[PDB]
Design an enzyme around this catalytic site. Structure first.
Site, PDB file in Angstrom:
ATOM      1  N   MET A  87      29.532 151.418  -8.439  1.00  0.00           N
ATOM      2  CA  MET A  87      29.427 152.587  -8.116  1.00  0.00           C
ATOM      3  C   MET A  87      29.184 152.053  -6.674  1.00  0.00           C
ATOM      4  N   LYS A 102     -11.295 155.256 -23.193  1.00  0.00           N
ATOM      5  CA  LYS A 102     -12.053 155.701 -24.280  1.00  0.00           C
ATOM      6  C   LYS A 102     -13.130 156.058 -24.886  1.00  0.00           C
ATOM      7  N   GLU A 104       6.900 149.797 -21.571  1.00  0.00           N
ATOM      8  CA  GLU A 104       6.661 151.390 -21.738  1.00  0.00           C
ATOM      9  C   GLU A 104       7.041 151.536 -21.407  1.00  0.00           C
ATOM     10  N   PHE A 158     -11.616 147.357 -14.679  1.00  0.00           N
ATOM     11  CA  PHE A 158     -10.946 146.586 -15.338  1.00  0.00           C
ATOM     12  C   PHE A 158      -9.491 147.828 -16.426  1.00  0.00           C
ATOM     13  N   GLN A 159      -8.102 146.961 -15.760  1.00  0.00           N
ATOM     14  CA  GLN A 159      -6.942 147.776 -15.841  1.00  0.00           C
ATOM     15  C   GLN A 159      -7.784 149.642 -15.671  1.00  0.00           C
TER      16      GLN A 159
HETATM   17  C1  FAD Z   1      25.074 158.643 -10.531  1.00  0.00           C
HETATM   18  C2  FAD Z   1      26.137 160.581 -10.405  1.00  0.00           C
HETATM   19  C3  FAD Z   1      27.217 161.241 -10.328  1.00  0.00           C
HETATM   20  C4  FAD Z   1      26.482 162.677 -10.613  1.00  0.00           C
HETATM   21  N1  FAD Z   1      27.919 163.379 -10.365  1.00  0.00           N
HETATM   22  C5  FAD Z   1      27.885 164.542 -10.772  1.00  0.00           C
HETATM   23  C6  FAD Z   1      29.014 165.465 -10.524  1.00  0.00           C
HETATM   24  O1  FAD Z   1      29.975 165.326  -9.923  1.00  0.00           O
HETATM   25  N2  FAD Z   1      29.172 166.861 -11.905  1.00  0.00           N
HETATM   26  C7  FAD Z   1      27.659 167.294 -12.243  1.00  0.00           C
HETATM   27  O2  FAD Z   1      27.923 168.154 -13.092  1.00  0.00           O
HETATM   28  N3  FAD Z   1      26.595 166.385 -11.863  1.00  0.00           N
HETATM   29  C8  FAD Z   1      26.124 165.560 -11.219  1.00  0.00           C
HETATM   30  N4  FAD Z   1      25.003 164.185 -11.106  1.00  0.00           N
HETATM   31  C9  FAD Z   1      24.051 165.471 -12.170  1.00  0.00           C
HETATM   32  C10 FAD Z   1      23.393 165.729 -11.342  1.00  0.00           C
HETATM   33  O3  FAD Z   1      22.794 164.943 -10.046  1.00  0.00           O
HETATM   34  C11 FAD Z   1      22.478 166.633 -11.864  1.00  0.00           C
HETATM   35  O4  FAD Z   1      21.555 165.850 -13.164  1.00  0.00           O
HETATM   36  C12 FAD Z   1      23.285 167.940 -12.833  1.00  0.00           C
HETATM   37  O5  FAD Z   1      24.506 168.514 -12.067  1.00  0.00           O
HETATM   38  C13 FAD Z   1      21.897 168.853 -13.304  1.00  0.00           C
HETATM   39  O6  FAD Z   1      22.612 169.580 -14.352  1.00  0.00           O
HETATM   40  P1  FAD Z   1      21.935 170.669 -15.469  1.00  0.00           P
HETATM   41  O7  FAD Z   1      21.836 172.117 -13.120  1.00  0.00           O
HETATM   42  O8  FAD Z   1      23.302 171.805 -16.050  1.00  0.00           O
HETATM   43  O9  FAD Z   1      20.678 170.108 -15.398  1.00  0.00           O
HETATM   44  P2  FAD Z   1      19.039 171.099 -14.733  1.00  0.00           P
HETATM   45  O10 FAD Z   1      19.164 169.774 -14.120  1.00  0.00           O
HETATM   46  O11 FAD Z   1      18.464 170.301 -15.555  1.00  0.00           O
HETATM   47  O12 FAD Z   1      19.255 172.255 -14.606  1.00  0.00           O
HETATM   48  C14 FAD Z   1      18.945 173.083 -15.018  1.00  0.00           C
HETATM   49  C15 FAD Z   1      18.259 174.667 -14.890  1.00  0.00           C
HETATM   50  O13 FAD Z   1      18.426 175.243 -16.159  1.00  0.00           O
HETATM   51  C16 FAD Z   1      16.635 175.687 -16.218  1.00  0.00           C
HETATM   52  N5  FAD Z   1      16.789 176.117 -17.070  1.00  0.00           N
HETATM   53  C17 FAD Z   1      16.105 175.371 -18.479  1.00  0.00           C
HETATM   54  N6  FAD Z   1      16.435 175.785 -19.659  1.00  0.00           N
HETATM   55  C18 FAD Z   1      16.242 177.403 -19.571  1.00  0.00           C
HETATM   56  C19 FAD Z   1      16.606 178.541 -20.428  1.00  0.00           C
HETATM   57  N7  FAD Z   1      15.805 177.886 -21.096  1.00  0.00           N
HETATM   58  N8  FAD Z   1      16.606 179.297 -19.575  1.00  0.00           N
HETATM   59  C20 FAD Z   1      17.615 179.790 -18.527  1.00  0.00           C
HETATM   60  N9  FAD Z   1      17.218 178.231 -17.359  1.00  0.00           N
HETATM   61  C21 FAD Z   1      16.948 176.993 -18.328  1.00  0.00           C
HETATM   62  C22 FAD Z   1      16.244 174.446 -15.849  1.00  0.00           C
HETATM   63  O14 FAD Z   1      15.149 175.384 -15.172  1.00  0.00           O
HETATM   64  C23 FAD Z   1      16.934 173.996 -14.071  1.00  0.00           C
HETATM   65  O15 FAD Z   1      17.168 175.185 -13.706  1.00  0.00           O
HETATM   66  C24 FAD Z   1      25.843 163.286 -11.765  1.00  0.00           C
HETATM   67  C25 FAD Z   1      24.403 162.151 -10.851  1.00  0.00           C
HETATM   68  C26 FAD Z   1      24.708 160.634 -11.475  1.00  0.00           C
HETATM   69  C27 FAD Z   1      23.558 159.614 -11.643  1.00  0.00           C
HETATM   70  C1  FAD Z   2      -7.841 139.456 -20.030  1.00  0.00           C
HETATM   71  C2  FAD Z   2      -8.470 139.574 -18.878  1.00  0.00           C
HETATM   72  C3  FAD Z   2      -9.977 138.719 -18.823  1.00  0.00           C
HETATM   73  C4  FAD Z   2     -10.309 138.257 -17.960  1.00  0.00           C
HETATM   74  N1  FAD Z   2     -11.840 137.930 -18.089  1.00  0.00           N
HETATM   75  C5  FAD Z   2     -11.959 137.362 -16.819  1.00  0.00           C
HETATM   76  C6  FAD Z   2     -13.328 136.898 -17.170  1.00  0.00           C
HETATM   77  O1  FAD Z   2     -14.225 136.483 -18.103  1.00  0.00           O
HETATM   78  N2  FAD Z   2     -13.774 136.060 -15.663  1.00  0.00           N
HETATM   79  C7  FAD Z   2     -13.069 136.093 -14.684  1.00  0.00           C
HETATM   80  O2  FAD Z   2     -13.854 135.863 -13.795  1.00  0.00           O
HETATM   81  N3  FAD Z   2     -11.867 137.262 -14.483  1.00  0.00           N
HETATM   82  C8  FAD Z   2     -11.541 137.678 -15.639  1.00  0.00           C
HETATM   83  N4  FAD Z   2     -10.623 138.401 -14.967  1.00  0.00           N
HETATM   84  C9  FAD Z   2     -10.465 138.844 -13.994  1.00  0.00           C
HETATM   85  C10 FAD Z   2     -10.451 139.991 -13.758  1.00  0.00           C
HETATM   86  O3  FAD Z   2     -10.660 141.508 -14.483  1.00  0.00           O
HETATM   87  C11 FAD Z   2     -10.695 140.243 -11.870  1.00  0.00           C
HETATM   88  O4  FAD Z   2      -9.306 140.418 -11.634  1.00  0.00           O
HETATM   89  C12 FAD Z   2     -11.434 138.613 -11.525  1.00  0.00           C
HETATM   90  O5  FAD Z   2     -12.685 138.672 -11.841  1.00  0.00           O
HETATM   91  C13 FAD Z   2     -11.471 139.827  -9.410  1.00  0.00           C
HETATM   92  O6  FAD Z   2     -11.881 137.829  -8.877  1.00  0.00           O
HETATM   93  P1  FAD Z   2     -12.249 137.982  -7.709  1.00  0.00           P
HETATM   94  O7  FAD Z   2     -13.821 138.982  -7.201  1.00  0.00           O
HETATM   95  O8  FAD Z   2     -12.675 137.135  -6.954  1.00  0.00           O
HETATM   96  O9  FAD Z   2     -10.686 138.932  -6.998  1.00  0.00           O
HETATM   97  P2  FAD Z   2     -10.704 140.174  -6.191  1.00  0.00           P
HETATM   98  O10 FAD Z   2     -10.629 141.350  -6.969  1.00  0.00           O
HETATM   99  O11 FAD Z   2      -9.205 139.988  -5.300  1.00  0.00           O
HETATM  100  O12 FAD Z   2     -11.851 140.592  -5.274  1.00  0.00           O
HETATM  101  C14 FAD Z   2     -12.143 139.428  -4.202  1.00  0.00           C
HETATM  102  C15 FAD Z   2     -13.022 140.080  -2.854  1.00  0.00           C
HETATM  103  O13 FAD Z   2     -13.097 139.391  -1.798  1.00  0.00           O
HETATM  104  C16 FAD Z   2     -12.648 140.192  -0.791  1.00  0.00           C
HETATM  105  N5  FAD Z   2     -12.327 139.865   0.038  1.00  0.00           N
HETATM  106  C17 FAD Z   2     -10.501 139.470  -0.126  1.00  0.00           C
HETATM  107  N6  FAD Z   2     -10.775 138.648   1.863  1.00  0.00           N
HETATM  108  C18 FAD Z   2     -11.777 138.476   2.485  1.00  0.00           C
HETATM  109  C19 FAD Z   2     -12.250 137.611   2.918  1.00  0.00           C
HETATM  110  N7  FAD Z   2     -11.490 136.953   3.851  1.00  0.00           N
HETATM  111  N8  FAD Z   2     -13.431 137.779   3.357  1.00  0.00           N
HETATM  112  C20 FAD Z   2     -14.495 138.242   2.653  1.00  0.00           C
HETATM  113  N9  FAD Z   2     -14.348 138.375   1.261  1.00  0.00           N
HETATM  114  C21 FAD Z   2     -13.064 139.302   0.894  1.00  0.00           C
HETATM  115  C22 FAD Z   2     -12.589 141.498  -1.607  1.00  0.00           C
HETATM  116  O14 FAD Z   2     -11.559 143.014  -0.313  1.00  0.00           O
HETATM  117  C23 FAD Z   2     -12.626 141.553  -2.542  1.00  0.00           C
HETATM  118  O15 FAD Z   2     -14.017 142.856  -2.698  1.00  0.00           O
HETATM  119  C24 FAD Z   2      -9.366 138.668 -16.587  1.00  0.00           C
HETATM  120  C25 FAD Z   2      -8.583 139.046 -16.186  1.00  0.00           C
HETATM  121  C26 FAD Z   2      -7.718 140.025 -17.576  1.00  0.00           C
HETATM  122  C27 FAD Z   2      -6.634 140.168 -17.604  1.00  0.00           C
END
Ligand code: FAD
Ligand code: FAD
Ligand code: FAD
Ligand code: G8A
Ligand code: G8A
Ligand code: TP9
Ligand code: TP9
Ligand code: K
Ligand code: K
Ligand code: MG
Ligand code: MG
Lengths: 599, 599, 217
Positions: B494, B173, B61, B123-124
């Protein structure tokens, strides 16, 4: 004079970076995972060629984060991450969220722009304290070098106590470049049970001593003390209690023991799920009643709730974090604190029980009735993913080495959980709460660094593996001979399973293209093995496990195969879908028809 | 009756997911970048096989996020991201932070666990509204389907107005699965200058009409209106003013024009830097006075500050965001609003000027004195990275196609900025404010999808490319024939430049191992070209540009070469380090000695 | 207590759950928890600041609440004003920091302050800002504030010398020509010895005296 005894001058003249280095040593850090950048250079300069710890360089800071998680889970020590400001820091957010959800002690040190630039939308400035607030136990920005030792101690302490979890310490570049010019409190330079709880333990024991149908529901918390699995077994043996575990508790109980009910939950054993729905006393040991485990909460544990109401059972919750007591289900007795310490007090109060004929008759019948069944290979068919896992499990246990398994997220993860036989603590290292695809490979590298003599196997899905496959180079550079097995079904199988079930086989964007995994391995300087048919399975898995270097095994496996059993959303834990050969055939025919033969 | 005219029934009976689909169409979205998961399935089901927009599937992602950024920057339209809950959402945080810092309109839709599960550590479940608060302009969680159209309109509006930037909409969801059962306000189903500003424009014109040494400092804001570069040129021509641009303004002014001073700043032209330090009037057009541009702020623009105090010049700041007016430097006149619209009012008040002999004499002398010089190839030496960029720039301008350049972050990025000749708007797509390594490849894919007939070239560093190289598969699957050039110096150049300069050649963890890029390309089903020596440069670059499919060009280039000129931290903009052949030789000898011949 | 009383003083809150304050301590705790030089960068800024003041022809002290945060503050303010012969205006919150009976007193400046004080700061070539934050009740229209001091800074003969303990309030409203970070009273001890004694400023004090006569309350 007493003042002199309480102040310390020994860090005067050191830079913040050098102080960081010294505090790592005092905290017994032996490994740091990290990646350099401009804001964190004063710290990287201080640790230059350090022989005090191993430094592991990933390709991406998300990799550093999951590596540190795998390291922490394998070792029981905190995983230390060291990254730069801005995108170095924001790239560790998924690993921090992951660590929070799974209770993993992660200590993240992020460089920051100098204090003179903070709040100016400076070059490479992120508000990482703001961003990471919701995915850390605690975080802080260090504002001067005199408080740096204190903040480092606080971080390690918070990360590793209570429920373990991630912390972040933000390190402005002018602080780490600055030199300590003043003495600091010497305490900052160095890293009984309540009567209320004692009474709860006694009441809990009296409840268990009445139980006729007890069950232990054990989770990750039992792994947080070296003596945990020992005391779990002592309790189960003494009171004669069957044991089920969560995904995260796998390995806490020897699954070869007849008392083992295997994993419970959405994809856990229908025997375990039946047993907990029928138990009159549930002993919850370090588990949080996650919604993957409980099924429909209102229908969860009806026999234990009935027993509690009748004063003859209930739920006994041994939990270290008050937040997770009475969060999901009401505890009949809540026993607060470290589960292993509290078990030492509990077990002597618990009556020894020789036999439970009627209960174990039911348990044994349920185990026989509810194996993890699936459709076997047929002549000419692809390898079934379930069969592959059994093969790896059977062969890995040959070696005279500890075996640690990491996984990605999806069906392969569930089949790994089901079909390995789990026997040792801290051998299942898997993203459960957050469920982060891509975890498997970097977590394996961290686990392998933690345990250099272990066999470390990443059971990975092809989509999960694609997320982070660049870290193969990192395994080589770190000298970590991990074993990656990609279950290649050319699909996001977990999602296609739901689309088959609930969306009439409409596979919306769930088939990503895969690279050639053998040429990929070659490009990364890792050994590659490819298993394409049934007749290559045993020998290819042997070659995989025999390898003494990083190795990628790709296995072509059957597509569109559901994980069963399954408790669907909304259903009670004992209202599960079971595997049935005829149903699977009909489902295949239906899928074929609906997709015009495409799937 | 009027009520009926103001309420709309047309979405009744649609799911939230179907409503999302319809609102995309109404917002003229032609491309969505995203990745499925359980929480977002009702939306993926609604967009199943849609012919209303192209869906682009990354491997990660973060890839979707940077792709959408590249798309937005190339097209001037918002980049739309669609991801699942939990880690799907947290994986987009770096792209959101990136988009915020560079003013990129990113509209991120994240699945979320059902409202019945929020706040239960489900979960998640991530608190993505909390986590993303600091790296979005605005975010929201949709709580019922009736407000979904409104929240979608608000997101697009906020993302694209004022200073553009990222927004996030969280989609539980149960909301996207739910069906709309009630009418909703019809306005929710559809997507003059102040006297104060008019007076400021008049005063600004009177100030410029007095100026003897004016300079235009133009940035990204001039690119946010199609007529921007036209009006910039009209002003520069009319009043006879030399023009410098930021990194993000490259392409806003034709660098072939004699009035062009090229890029200013830390690694910009010493002519541009000298000119702005000596100008009596600075016309700042859509640029934010970033700390990479100003050098030491207290020493910035001394002649313009003097002129302001004497009532004969100063800084005229045309800026759309009040937050960035008077944030870094005091504006003599602040002209608030869209710079292009305000230039239409300004230019008629500005006096036409035929010649400025003394000023342009200085400008011309400075340009002659301060080219981007560097050490040329010698017999047997590796290709110099500066030479490679010139070669690509010269050959790319042969084709009858638009040429868009994306980059990674590091020395290669700076040499791309310096050594390409920039002539067209929205052709430099680079991470500047946050500076995210790994941006180059996914941004190129997004830009290529936005502009299918353009040549899109990712000038990438080897460490940057390693961050996200899994997305090569995505380019193939999306049919995006991007051209990736990896400048392979086997170092984080760098950072090693700073370690050479400030840390006595102590290279702390700044040499990551590289995969075999040709076997990597092969594994990803992309064409691979490798240039290893000077005699392969022209023909290899031709093969690269002639390719009509995705292609990866690896070029072995000289190591430990600094980017010059350089304004070091703490120094005034006109206090720069310039290239000198003898100094470079001494520095090489010193490095060799210090590292015992290793570097 | 430490945070409340250091840097710029300010409020802190400590939330005390009832079960914590009712509970009894059962374990030992670190003994430190049971008990309550100038940077070269700043030393150089102080020297440059003194060289700037030593050029000034129309100096003015703008003193605020920060001078009250050290018992010796008003003493050192008077020592500076006497030594270099500088008129003194204060904010509302600095009232009492300078004896208003002294002829060098310009009284309070700002929205409702003395028109003499306001005229003087608008015409001064060097503004010594001592523990004051350039509040919008004091500066008037910010773009039109202190034009003679800004001119002097650009010509290398004056400017704004800001003695301020909180980096947040340095260069927040107006650009300091020299920023002197830290406790204003401590930094004045270093500053004053570098400052030249001045016997008279006839033309400046002629203007000051005329303005005071012209602009009573
Ligand atoms: C390794 C490294 C080295 C770098 N060295 C340099 C360097 O030497 N020189 C350099 O230039 N950069 C350098 N940078 C980039 C620097 O960190 C900035 O990202 C960059 O300078 C920002 O450029 P900017 O102000 O044009 O753009 P932005 O950061 O996007 O700022 C744009 C400004 O314009 C405004 N704005 C946006 N839209 C409008 C609009 N429609 N009308 C009016 N205002 C608007 C914004 O609100 C903002 O204040 C470097 C980056 C890295 C990773
Ligand atoms: C695709 C998927 C499917 C899943 N399906 C399952 C499933 O079918 N069955 C399943 O079991 N899991 C499943 N899970 C896992 C699930 O989401 C949980 O992560 C899991 O069940 C948590 O197990 P747990 O409670 O033992 O561990 P934890 O989430 O770590 O919880 C531990 C608990 O013990 C406590 N604790 C920690 N240390 C101590 C200590 N020293 N003394 C006392 N308490 C303590 C903690 O505070 C906490 O409340 C699945 C995960 C995925 C990704
Ligand atoms: C109706 C009304 C009208 C007003 N009109 C006026 C007016 O006309 N004129 C006027 O002056 N005020 C006026 N005010 C008050 C005005 O709003 C401010 O409160 C006041 O000007 C602030 O004064 P100050 O900067 O000295 O104090 P503060 O606001 O306390 O600022 C003190 C500054 O000194 C710093 N500091 C603190 N301790 C130290 C230290 N040890 N060393 C160095 N620095 C330190 C602080 O960090 C801070 O930047 C008015 C208020 C009201 C209610
Ligand atoms: C990237 C870290 O930026 C900062 O911390 C910083 C931010 C804002 C203002 C001042 C600074 S800084 O001056 O303290 N350091 C600085 O700029 N370092 C630096 N390092 C490299 I490697 C490259 C580079 O520019 C390409 N800049
Ligand atoms: C992952 C999205 O989770 C939720 O949104 C959710 C969260 C907490 C409680 C209930 C739900 S849910 O019931 O609405 N949906 C659900 O669980 N979906 C689901 N999808 C897949 I694909 C796999 C899977 O389990 C492996 N679960
Ligand atoms: C997309 C998705 N889940 C949503 C998702 C999206 N993005 C991330 C970072 N993590 C998750 N969990 C899954 S489980 C598919 C996994 O596919 P796989 O790795 O090939 O495994 P398998 O096919 O065995 O199910
Ligand atoms: C580590 C680092 N910067 C810190 C850093 C860390 N992590 C991220 C995600 N982004 C950045 N910018 C750089 S610039 C090295 C870039 O190396 P390169 O991609 O091979 O480029 P080059 O060698 O041309 O400088
Ligand atoms: K098992
Ligand atoms: K150029
Ligand atoms: Mg798969
Ligand atoms: Mg490089």
């Amino acid at each position: 004079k007493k003042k002199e005894q309480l102040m310390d001058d020994s860090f005067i003249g050191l830079t913040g970076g050098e102080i960081f280095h010294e505090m790592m040593l005092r905290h017994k850090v032996d490994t740091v995972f990290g990646y350099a950048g401009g804001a964190i250079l004063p710290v990287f300069d201080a640790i230059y060629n350090s022989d005090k710890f191993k430094f592991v360089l990933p390709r991406h800071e998300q990799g550093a984060g999951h590596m540190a998680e795998g390291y922490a889970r394998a070792s029981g020590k905190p995983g230390v991450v060291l990254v730069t400001s801005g995108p170095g820091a924001t790239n560790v957010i998924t690993p921090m969220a992951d660590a929070l959800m799974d209770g993993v002690p992660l200590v993240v040190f992020s460089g920051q722009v100098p204090t003179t630039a903070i709040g100016t939308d400076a070059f490479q400035e992120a508000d990482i304290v703001g961003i990471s607030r919701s995915c850390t136990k605690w975080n802080v920005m260090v504002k001067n070098v005199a408080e740096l030792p204190r903040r480092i101690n606080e971080a390690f302490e918070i990360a590793t106590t209570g429920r373990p979890g991630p912390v972040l310490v933000d390190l402005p570049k002018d602080v780490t470049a600055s030199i300590l010019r003043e003495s600091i409190p010497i305490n900052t330079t160095l890293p009984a049970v309540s009567e209320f709880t004692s009474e709860a333990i006694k009441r809990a024991a009296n409840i268990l001593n009445k139980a006729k149908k007890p069950i232990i529901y054990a989770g990750a918390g039992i792994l947080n003390n070296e003596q945990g699995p020992k005391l779990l077994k002592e309790l189960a043996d003494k009171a004669n209690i069957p044991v089920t575990t969560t995904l995260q508790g796998l390995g806490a109980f020897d699954q070869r023991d007849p008392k083992s009910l295997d994993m419970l939950g959405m994809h856990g054993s229908a025997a375990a799920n039946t047993a907990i729905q029928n138990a009159d006393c549930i002993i919850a040991l370090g588990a949080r009643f996650d919604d993957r485990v409980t099924g429909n909460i209102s229908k969860f544990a009806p026999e234990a709730k009935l027993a509690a109401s009748e004063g003859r059972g209930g739920i006994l919750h041994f939990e270290i974090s008050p937040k997770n007591i009475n969060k999901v289900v009401e505890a009949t007795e809540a026993i607060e604190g470290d589960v292993t310490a509290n078990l030492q007090s509990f077990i002597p109060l618990v009556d020894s029980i020789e036999n439970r004929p009627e209960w174990f008759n039911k348990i044994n019948e349920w185990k026989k009735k509810y194996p993890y069944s699936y459709q076997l290979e047929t002549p000419g068919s692809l390898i079934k993913p379930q069969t592959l896992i059994k093969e790896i499990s059977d062969q890995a246990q040959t070696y005279n080495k500890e075996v640690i398994v990491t996984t990605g997220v999806g069906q392969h993860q569930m089949w790994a959980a089901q079909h390995f036989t789990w026997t040792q603590p801290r051998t299942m290292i898997t993203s459960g709460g957050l469920g982060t695809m891509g975890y498997g490979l970097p977590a394996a590298i961290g686990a392998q660094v933690a345990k250099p003599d272990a066999i470390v196997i990443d059971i990975d899905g092809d989509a999960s593996f694609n997320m982070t496959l660049t870290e193969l180079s990192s395994a080589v550079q770190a000298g970590a001979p991990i074993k990656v097995c990609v279950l290649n079904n050319e699909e996001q199988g977990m999602v296609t399973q739901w689309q088959s079930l609930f969306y009439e086989h409409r596979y919306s964007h769930t088939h990503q293209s895969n690279p050639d995994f053998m040429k990929l391995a070659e490009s990364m300087n890792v050994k590659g093995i490819r298993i394409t048919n049934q007749q290559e399975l045993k020998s290819g898995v042997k070659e995989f496990l025999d390898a003494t270097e990083p190795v990628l095994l790709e296995v072509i496996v059957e597509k569109k195969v559901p994980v069963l059993p399954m408790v669907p959303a909304g259903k009670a834990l004992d209202d599960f879908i079971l595997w049935d050969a005829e149903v699977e055939k009909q489902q295949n025919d239906l899928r074929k028809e609906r997709t015009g033969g495409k799937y």
